[PDB]
C-alpha cells in the first residue's frame, strides 16, 4: 500500500547522517526485533547542560510523493537507571524536515535551528526502560509515526533534535501512501 523512501535498517555500514554538535548524536550498532544487526544513533548528554543536538539524515528523494510519513523506532533511558542524576534529562525530541531540489546541504548551510527547518512535531516517549534486554521487552521500544505537508521539491532531509535527553533512534523509515485515504 505504501512505498518506502529511506529505511536505515538495511545499511550494514555507516548511514552517513550528519551530526551537528559532534558531541551529540553518535552512530552505534544495535539490534531489533529479530536480533538483526542495525545502524542506530543515540544521545545521552544528561550530565552536561544547555543541550541542542541535531541529527540530519542524508538527502531523501520525493519520488513523486505529496505526503511524507516518517516512522520512528526509539528507546529512552530512565534518568534514574543512570549513575549520575543531574537536573533536566528530557525525553522528547523534535522532528524537522527541509526541502531542496539538489543535495547542496553542507556541514553548515541548512542552518541548525528551527528557522530554515520546518517542524513536523515534538515526539514524546511513553516508555522508558532502566535495564537493557536484547530480544525481550518489545513494548519497551517506542514507535511514533508522523506526516508532514505537501512537499513539491525534488527531495528533502529530516533532522532530529535533542535537548538533554538520553535516547536511542533504533529505526527510521520515510515513506508515502500510494492510495487515497
Amino acid at each position: 500500500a505504501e512505498e518506502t523512501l529511506m529505511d536505515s535498517t538495511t545499511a550494514t555500514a555507516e548511514l552517513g547522517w550528519m551530526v551537528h554538535p559532534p558531541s551529540g548524536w553518535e552512530e552505534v550498532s544495535g539490534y531489533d526485533e529479530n536480533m538483526n544487526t542495525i545502524r542506530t544513533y543515540q544521545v545521552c548528554n544528561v550530565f552536561e547542560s544547555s543541550q541542542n543536538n541535531w541529527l540530519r539524515t542524508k538527502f531523501i528523494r520525493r519520488r513523486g510523493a505529496h505526503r511524507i510519513h516518517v516512522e520512528m523506532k526509539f528507546s529512552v533511558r530512565d534518568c534514574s537507571s543512570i549513575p549520575s542524576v543531574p537536573g533536566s534529562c528530557k525525553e522528547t525530541f523534535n522532528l524537522y524536515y527541509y526541502e531542496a531540489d539538489f543535495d547542496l546541504a553542507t556541514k553548515t548551510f541548512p542552518n541548525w535551528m528551527e528557522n530554515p527547518w520546518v517542524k513536523v512535531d515534538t515526539i514524546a516517549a511513553d516508555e522508558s526502560f532502566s535495564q537493557v534486554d536484547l530480544g525481550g521487552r518489545v513494548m519497551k521500544i517506542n514507535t511514533e509515526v508522523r506526516s508532514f505537508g505537501p512537499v513539491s521539491r525534488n527531495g528533502f532531509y529530516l533532522a532530529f533534535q535533542d535537548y538533554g535527553g538520553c535516547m536511542s533512534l533504533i529505526a527510521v523509515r520515510v515513506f508515502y501512501r500510494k492510495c487515497p485515504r
Binding site: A13, G30, S75, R77, V132, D133
Partner: protein, 138 residues
C-alpha cells in the same frame, strides 16, 4: 576514542595462532568489527561467518550452543557487514549492549568460512584459524 576496526577475515593476521586477539577497551570508546565484502576482483571468494559474543567457557570450548549474543551475520557478499560496539556501562537503548568495567568479553565465530557451514556451532575458524577476540574492559 575510535579504536582501529577489527576486520574479521581469515587473513586479518592479528588473530595470532593459538591465542586469537586481545584489546583492553575502555569505557567511552567505540569499535567496529567488520566483515569484508568480496570486491569485483582481488577478493578470492567471500567468507561467510556468524560472529557471536559468548562467555569465557564457550569461547575456549569453541561452542556457541546454549546461549550467546549475536553480533554479525556475515552472509552478504556485496556489502560490508559490521557491528559498532560502544563500551558503555549503561545503555540508553533497550536491546543494547552493556559492559562492566574490569570484566572480560569474548567474541567468537564457529562458522567455517563457507555458506554451507555458516551455522555450525562447534569449532572451525574459532578452533581452526584461532579467530577469537578477548576484550579487557577497564
Amino acid at each position: 576514542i575510535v579504536l582501529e576496526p577489527i576486520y574479521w577475515n581469515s587473513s586479518n593476521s592479528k588473530f595470532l595462532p593459538g591465542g586469537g586477539l586481545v584489546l583492553y577497551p575502555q569505557i567511552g570508546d567505540k569499535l567496529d568489527i567488520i566483515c569484508p565484502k568480496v570486491d569485483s576482483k582481488t577478493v578470492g571468494q567471500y567468507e561467510y561467518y556468524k560472529v557471536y559474543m559468548v562467555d569465557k567457557d564457550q569461547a575456549d570450548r569453541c561452542t556457541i550452543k546454549k546461549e550467546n549474543t549475536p553480533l554479525l551475520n556475515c552472509a552478504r557478499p556485496d556489502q560490508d557487514v559490521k557491528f559498532t560496539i560502544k563500551f558503555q556501562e549503561f545503555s540508553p537503548n533497550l536491546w543494547g549492549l552493556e559492559f562492566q568495567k574490569n570484566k572480560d568479553y569474548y567474541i567468537i565465530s564457529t562458522s567455517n568460512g563457507s555458506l554451507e557451514g555458516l551455522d555450525n556451532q562447534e569449532g572451525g575458524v574459532c578452533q581452526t584459524r584461532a579467530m577469537k577476540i578477548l576484550m579487557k574492559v577497564g
